[PDB]
Scaffold this motif. Structure first.
Motif, mmCIF file in Angstrom:
data_model
loop_
_atom_site.group_PDB
_atom_site.id
_atom_site.type_symbol
_atom_site.label_atom_id
_atom_site.label_comp_id
_atom_site.label_asym_id
_atom_site.label_seq_id
_atom_site.Cartn_x
_atom_site.Cartn_y
_atom_site.Cartn_z
ATOM 1 N N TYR A 101 0.769 -1.234 0.000
ATOM 2 C CA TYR A 101 0.000 0.000 0.000
ATOM 3 C C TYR A 101 0.801 1.286 0.000
ATOM 4 O O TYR A 101 1.861 1.377 0.624
ATOM 5 C CB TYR A 101 -0.919 0.045 1.216
ATOM 6 C CG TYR A 101 -2.053 -0.941 1.201
ATOM 7 C CD1 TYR A 101 -3.087 -0.828 0.272
ATOM 8 C CD2 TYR A 101 -2.122 -1.967 2.151
ATOM 9 C CE1 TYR A 101 -4.165 -1.701 0.293
ATOM 10 C CE2 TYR A 101 -3.197 -2.853 2.178
ATOM 11 C CZ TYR A 101 -4.212 -2.713 1.247
ATOM 12 O OH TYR A 101 -5.272 -3.585 1.257
ATOM 13 N N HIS A 157 -18.788 -11.316 6.430
ATOM 14 C CA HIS A 157 -17.434 -11.513 5.954
ATOM 15 C C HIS A 157 -17.480 -12.893 5.293
ATOM 16 O O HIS A 157 -17.861 -13.867 5.934
ATOM 17 C CB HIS A 157 -16.447 -11.533 7.118
ATOM 18 C CG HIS A 157 -16.311 -10.221 7.827
ATOM 19 N ND1 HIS A 157 -15.087 -9.674 8.146
ATOM 20 C CD2 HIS A 157 -17.242 -9.363 8.303
ATOM 21 C CE1 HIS A 157 -15.271 -8.535 8.789
ATOM 22 N NE2 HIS A 157 -16.569 -8.323 8.897
ATOM 23 N N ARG A 161 -4.909 -1.248 -6.304
ATOM 24 C CA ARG A 161 -6.332 -1.087 -6.039
ATOM 25 C C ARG A 161 -7.198 -1.912 -6.984
ATOM 26 O O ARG A 161 -7.801 -1.374 -7.908
ATOM 27 C CB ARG A 161 -6.687 0.395 -6.167
ATOM 28 C CG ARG A 161 -5.659 1.318 -5.519
ATOM 29 C CD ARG A 161 -5.378 0.932 -4.065
ATOM 30 N NE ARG A 161 -6.595 0.940 -3.252
ATOM 31 C CZ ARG A 161 -7.004 -0.079 -2.500
ATOM 32 N NH1 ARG A 161 -6.289 -1.195 -2.449
ATOM 33 N NH2 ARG A 161 -8.138 0.005 -1.819
ATOM 34 N N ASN A 179 -12.508 -10.575 9.825
ATOM 35 C CA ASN A 179 -11.557 -9.584 10.313
ATOM 36 C C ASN A 179 -12.256 -8.862 11.472
ATOM 37 O O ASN A 179 -13.327 -8.276 11.281
ATOM 38 C CB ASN A 179 -11.229 -8.614 9.169
ATOM 39 C CG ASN A 179 -10.067 -7.683 9.481
ATOM 40 O OD1 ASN A 179 -9.560 -6.995 8.589
ATOM 41 N ND2 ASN A 179 -9.645 -7.649 10.739
ATOM 42 N N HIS A 201 -15.464 -0.396 8.085
ATOM 43 C CA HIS A 201 -16.823 -0.730 7.658
ATOM 44 C C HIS A 201 -17.829 0.346 8.059
ATOM 45 O O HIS A 201 -18.583 0.843 7.227
ATOM 46 C CB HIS A 201 -17.260 -2.054 8.277
ATOM 47 C CG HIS A 201 -16.921 -3.249 7.451
ATOM 48 N ND1 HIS A 201 -16.679 -4.488 8.001
ATOM 49 C CD2 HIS A 201 -16.798 -3.400 6.110
ATOM 50 C CE1 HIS A 201 -16.419 -5.350 7.035
ATOM 51 N NE2 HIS A 201 -16.484 -4.716 5.878
ATOM 52 N N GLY A 212 -11.220 -3.294 -2.678
ATOM 53 C CA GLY A 212 -12.402 -3.819 -2.027
ATOM 54 C C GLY A 212 -13.085 -2.678 -1.307
ATOM 55 O O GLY A 212 -14.313 -2.621 -1.231
ATOM 56 N N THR A 213 -12.287 -1.762 -0.771
ATOM 57 C CA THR A 213 -12.838 -0.606 -0.073
ATOM 58 C C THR A 213 -13.669 0.192 -1.071
ATOM 59 O O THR A 213 -14.752 0.682 -0.752
ATOM 60 C CB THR A 213 -11.731 0.310 0.477
ATOM 61 O OG1 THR A 213 -10.904 -0.426 1.381
ATOM 62 C CG2 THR A 213 -12.338 1.486 1.202
ATOM 63 N N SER A 249 -6.547 -7.575 -3.429
ATOM 64 C CA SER A 249 -5.384 -6.981 -2.792
ATOM 65 C C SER A 249 -4.508 -8.036 -2.146
ATOM 66 O O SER A 249 -3.280 -8.007 -2.290
ATOM 67 C CB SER A 249 -5.808 -5.977 -1.716
ATOM 68 O OG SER A 249 -6.520 -4.897 -2.274
ATOM 69 N N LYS A 250 -5.151 -8.967 -1.444
ATOM 70 C CA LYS A 250 -4.436 -10.006 -0.722
ATOM 71 C C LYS A 250 -4.065 -11.275 -1.491
ATOM 72 O O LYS A 250 -2.882 -11.630 -1.543
ATOM 73 C CB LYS A 250 -5.202 -10.384 0.562
ATOM 74 C CG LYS A 250 -5.329 -9.265 1.599
ATOM 75 C CD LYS A 250 -6.362 -8.238 1.173
ATOM 76 C CE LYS A 250 -6.529 -7.094 2.176
ATOM 77 N NZ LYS A 250 -7.947 -6.883 2.469
HETATM 78 C C1 LIG Z 1 -8.396 -5.880 3.301
HETATM 79 C C2 LIG Z 1 -9.933 -5.784 3.540
HETATM 80 C C3 LIG Z 1 -10.804 -5.259 2.520
HETATM 81 C C4 LIG Z 1 -10.403 -4.745 1.153
HETATM 82 O O1 LIG Z 1 -9.363 -3.803 1.132
HETATM 83 P P1 LIG Z 1 -8.526 -3.524 -0.140
HETATM 84 O O2 LIG Z 1 -7.434 -2.525 -0.051
HETATM 85 O O3 LIG Z 1 -9.399 -2.330 -0.294
HETATM 86 O O4 LIG Z 1 -9.111 -3.973 -1.451
HETATM 87 C C5 LIG Z 1 -12.158 -5.223 2.824
HETATM 88 N N1 LIG Z 1 -12.706 -5.653 4.014
HETATM 89 C C6 LIG Z 1 -11.874 -6.161 4.997
HETATM 90 C C7 LIG Z 1 -12.580 -6.619 6.276
HETATM 91 C C8 LIG Z 1 -10.503 -6.214 4.742
HETATM 92 O O5 LIG Z 1 -9.728 -6.721 5.743
#
Ligand SMILES: *Cc1c(COP(=O)(O)O)cnc(C)c1O
Ligand SMILES: *Cc1c(COP(=O)(O)O)cnc(C)c1O
Lengths: 396, 396
Positions: free
Chosen positions: A65, B178, B254, B183, B133, B103-104, B245-246
């Motif tokens: 990031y 989730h 992004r 998380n 969130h 994802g955000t 991302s992961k």
């Molecule tokens: C990592 C994560 C995302 C997505 O994040 P990215 O950078 O945006 O794509 C979404 N929700 C949770 C709970 C996460 O841990």
């Protein structure tokens, strides 16, 4: 839940593209779109950019990031481009820059920042203006007002009317200015008109917001910025939303920036934190690839020379087509005078065609333009200049 | 104008990073962050990704804008990953996918879509949940409510309490789930609990919103999706916000997606147009590079095999560290039992440490964790496992 959601209206520009899909006629000519085209009629990747993506491919060792405001190098190289290398704004640390997903992204970010951290309620945009301007600000809950700008009859900037409608603007209102290459008229203020606006602005207490998406397409990098630099010399606070979509041909990598300028570093740093907060709840952090490329080119002497030259070739080709367009029109015996388009800057110009003529050009000649009469000069080549002009002469 | 803007509060995770900057002590151990680390303690670029960026560098011939919803290939390859190759949802064209900036980004887009085109007013998120969130949804003007989830005492999913707090949720409310690797607890429902929730959901008339950011980190690609697939089998409408991302190590590019599912194609296409409108006024179109890479890997048999194997290596290393962590704790004579962390999935787990113990670990051992006690297992290596565990035993 999605039971009775109503269909969204067709976009004034993006929807025009679909019509090109269905139309299977060969000789079609697309003058809508909104991107650069070369003699071939293609939108290539700059050489400087390919060389930069080469470098990144051999040096990147992580995709971890970026900070909320993006790549730090991208930031200062952007501020130098906007304000000048020795700019006082930079020396005093009065500006902060956030890498954003395109120029449009910078506008939304600015809008969110303003609607949640200031007393701003109204934003003034020129008439006419890039349609998406009103949409972005309304989406943030701000009302958009319009001020006279274009003189439909003389095809020029109606400075008087402009000033007369801005008086109705109160202190605390935001006034949006196109840095150069006004979209869609292609008419920009003169340096003296810019200075007059910067003064009037400081007196009335307006907050200037510059949309700078075409730096380098009017006269040159430095020349195209004297307007914004005139305001920045007298203003305590400013907001510049810039894009690299065009002068770098990086449209789909979404590369832009939102720069915030305040009275002192203490203040800007505080205001910037809220701007970072607005970004945190939107997309979190900006995409690196596109911005990474820009920073690499701008900070490398060799590569920066190649890019500048490539930018110049783009600027001159457009200036070429503007002349070749007017002349061919006369050659084909066009009705009236079109010399005013040689006085305008950038990729766009109002052709002065009626909604019905536009509609006729498209239906009977496959020539595509926006209903407003806006034509993308960068879509003209020496190849289609004749068939194009002939069709126009047919509808006059 | 920016006269008295108040400083933004420090982010619960991103701000923790700064503390690492100042701390100059050598042996520091970062268990906050939120990204993957390998044996070396680095966050490398996957090989499959490098090979993909190689391909793109030799084949891309333009950087022209992508459609508002991004790359079409990215879209279907994403739907196949989520719902399965022969999924009925795909055959009937009941789903539409928009490529988003992370994802955000998919979450914000969904939030904007919902707040402007539906009667939705409340969103239910688990307690505890990824802090961002609540922020994203509140930013869109929706209120966020919480439902029991974590059993602090037994370190398990309190299914009963979960069901008892969801009853207070009315028909028309959105419930966020989730997909896998919850998380920050790391506790996911069993398949039978998922089926029970899918039924209960259809009865109460809730709108399910799955946040699927770790597909492939629990048991595997297909296994991690049976939860979402259980809901999709009985639901008329859904919304999935996924991230790459992961599982691709593409954090800064992004790369994410927001998938919309409706009763029929007629309806989804209509609802999707408004979703495209929400995107048009935000960032306009998604960045290509990151998504371009994903599509290339997923659609190429060879490359997709390499990536899957790389994903598996990431999954197993985390499963390794979970075991190596518990055992070393016993070896160092840790106070109580920590075997529950071997029952949890993904990169995160609640250590069950007090705010004060976290504070003590950091100040007296350079060991960094979130005040909540959340630790990133992927930040542990065989190298730091001993110094880490010893410090923990010191604060018990
Ligand atoms: C990592 C994560 C995302 C997505 O994040 P990215 O950078 O945006 O794509 C979404 N929700 C949770 C709970 C996460 O841990
Ligand atoms: C092209 C343009 C922009 C920026 O668009 P990008 O895709 O977003 O970066 C902004 N304003 C105007 C008037 C433009 O023509």
């Amino acid at each position: 839940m999605f039971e009775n959601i109503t269909t969204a209206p067709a976009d004034p520009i993006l929807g025009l593209a679909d019509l090109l899909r269905a139309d299977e006629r060969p000789g079609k000519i697309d003058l809508g779109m909104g991107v650069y085209n070369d003699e071939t009629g293609k939108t290539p990747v700059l050489t400087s950019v390919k060389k930069a993506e080469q470098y990144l491919l051999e040096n990147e060792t992580t995709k971890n990031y970026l900070g909320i405001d993006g790549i730090p190098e991208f930031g200062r190289c952007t501020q130098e481009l906007l304000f000048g290398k020795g700019s006082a704004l930079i020396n005093d640390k009065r500006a902060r820059t956030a890498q954003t997903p395109g120029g449009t992204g910078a506008l939304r970010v600015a809008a969110d920042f303003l609607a949640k951290n200031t007393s701003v309620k109204r934003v003034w945009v020129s008439n006419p203006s890039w349609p998406n301007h009103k949409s972005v600000f309304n989406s943030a809950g701000l009302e958009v007002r319009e001020y006279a700008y274009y003189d439909a009859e003389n095809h020029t900037l109606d400075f008087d009317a402009l000033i007369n409608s801005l008086n109705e603007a109160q202190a605390g209102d935001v006034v949006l200015f196109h840095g150069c290459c006004h979209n869609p008229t292609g008419i920009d203020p003169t340096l003296e008109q810019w200075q007059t606006l910067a003064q009037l602005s400081v007196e009335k207490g307006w907050l200037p917001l510059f949309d700078f998406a075409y730096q380098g397409f009017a006269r040159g990098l430095e020349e195209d910025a004297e307007g914004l630099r005139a305001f920045a010399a007298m203003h305590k606070e400013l907001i510049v939303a810039s894009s690299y979509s065009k002068n770098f041909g990086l449209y789909n990598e979404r590369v832009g920036a939102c720069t915030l300028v305040a009275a002192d570093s203490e203040t800007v740093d505080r205001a910037f934190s809220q701007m970072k907060a607005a970004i945190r709840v939107n997309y979190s952090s900006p995409p690196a690839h596109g911005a990474s490329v820009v920073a690499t080119i701008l900070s490398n002497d060799a590569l920066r020379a190649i890019w500048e030259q490539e930018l110049t070739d783009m600027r001159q080709r457009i200036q070429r087509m503007r002349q070749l367009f007017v002349n061919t029109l006369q050659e084909k015996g066009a009705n009236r005078d079109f010399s005013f388009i040689i006085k305008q800057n950038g990729m766009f110009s109002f052709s002065g065609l009626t909604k019905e003529q536009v509609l006729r050009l498209r239906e009977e000649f496959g020539v595509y333009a926006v209903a407003s009469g806006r034509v993308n000069v960068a879509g003209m080549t020496p190849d289609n200049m004749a068939p194009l002009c002939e069709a126009i002469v047919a509808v006059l």
